[PDB]
């Protein structure tokens, strides 16, 4: 009437009063990443690999008006500004993302992280009548 694992854990059982079979799985457990600025009053929250609905319905019991789904997870107390890019950051969250702080909506900005770029020229690519266009100093 009991299902055991190779390590001696309970992963299933059979009830005696109804002859039904179930499966026991452990409940969720995780951490939270807090991005805090120097002179800020409240840091930004990130629940990695979690949807905002799941956090608000099972985990978060505090009223948080700012929330949106991102690639890393649910971000709290921040705005969605992935269309803007920067060259340097002090709070790198991962996967080419960053959190920027704007001096005084939420004062935190969730933007991308592009530390390197390539220089562009207005010259042509194909042969201009059999000759190439090269800029010489």
Partner 1 sequence: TNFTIAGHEEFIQTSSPKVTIDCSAFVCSNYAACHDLLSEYGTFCDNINSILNEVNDLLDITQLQVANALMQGVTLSSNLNTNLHSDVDNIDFKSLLGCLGSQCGSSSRSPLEDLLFNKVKLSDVGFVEAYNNCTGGSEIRDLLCVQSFNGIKVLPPILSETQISGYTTAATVAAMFPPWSAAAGVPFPLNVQYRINGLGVTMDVLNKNQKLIANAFNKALLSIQNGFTATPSALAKIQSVVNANAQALNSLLQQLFNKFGAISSSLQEILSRLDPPEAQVQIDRLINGRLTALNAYVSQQLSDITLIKAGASRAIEKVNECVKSQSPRINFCGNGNHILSLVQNAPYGLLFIHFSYKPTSFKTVLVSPGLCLSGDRGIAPKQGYFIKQNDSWMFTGSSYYYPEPISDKNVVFMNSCSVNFTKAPFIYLN
Ligand X SMILES: *[C@@H]1O[C@H](CO)[C@@H](O)[C@H](O)[C@H]1NC(C)=O
Tell me which residues touch ligand X (CB under 6 A): 18-19, 87, 115-117
From the list 21, 84, 96, 102, which residue makes contact with partner 1 (rule: CB under 8 A)?
96
Residues 22, 51, 29, 48, Cα dihedral to 10°: 140
Rounded to whole angstroms, how far apart are CA atoms 60 and 40? 22
Q: Which of 46, 50, 52, 111 binds partner 1 (CB under 8 A)?
A: 50
The yes or no reply on residue 18 touching partner 1 (CB under 8 A) is: no
Selected binder of partner 1 within 1, 20, 26, 61 (CB under 8 A): 26
Among ligand X, partner 1, none, the one that 1 touches (CB under a kind-dependent 5 to 8 A) is none
Options 4, 21, 30, 90; binder of partner 1; rule CB under 8 A? 30
Backbone angles phi, psi at 52, to 5 degrees: -65, -35
DSSP 69-111: E-SSEEEES-EEEEEEEES--S-EEETTEEEEE-----SEEEE
- The reply to whether 122 sits near partner 1 by the rule CB under 8 A is yes
């Amino acid at each position: 009437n009991l299902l055991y694992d190779s390590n001696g854990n309970i992963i299933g059982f059979k009830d005696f009063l109804t002859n039904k079979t179930y499966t026991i799985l452990p409940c969720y457990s995780g951490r939270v990443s807090a991005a805090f600025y120097q002179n800020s009053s409240s840091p930004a929250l990130l629940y990695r690999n979690l949807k905002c609905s799941y956090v608000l319905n099972n985990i978060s019991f505090i009223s948080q008006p700012f929330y949106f789904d991102s690639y890393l997870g649910c971000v709290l107390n921040a705005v969605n500004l992935t269309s803007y890019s920067v060259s340097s950051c002090d709070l790198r969250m991962g996967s080419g993302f960053c959190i920027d702080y704007a001096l005084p909506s939420s004062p935190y900005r969730f933007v991308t992280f592009e530390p390197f770029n390539v220089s562009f020229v207005n010259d042509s690519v194909e042969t201009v009548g059999g000759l190439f266009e090269i800029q010489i100093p």
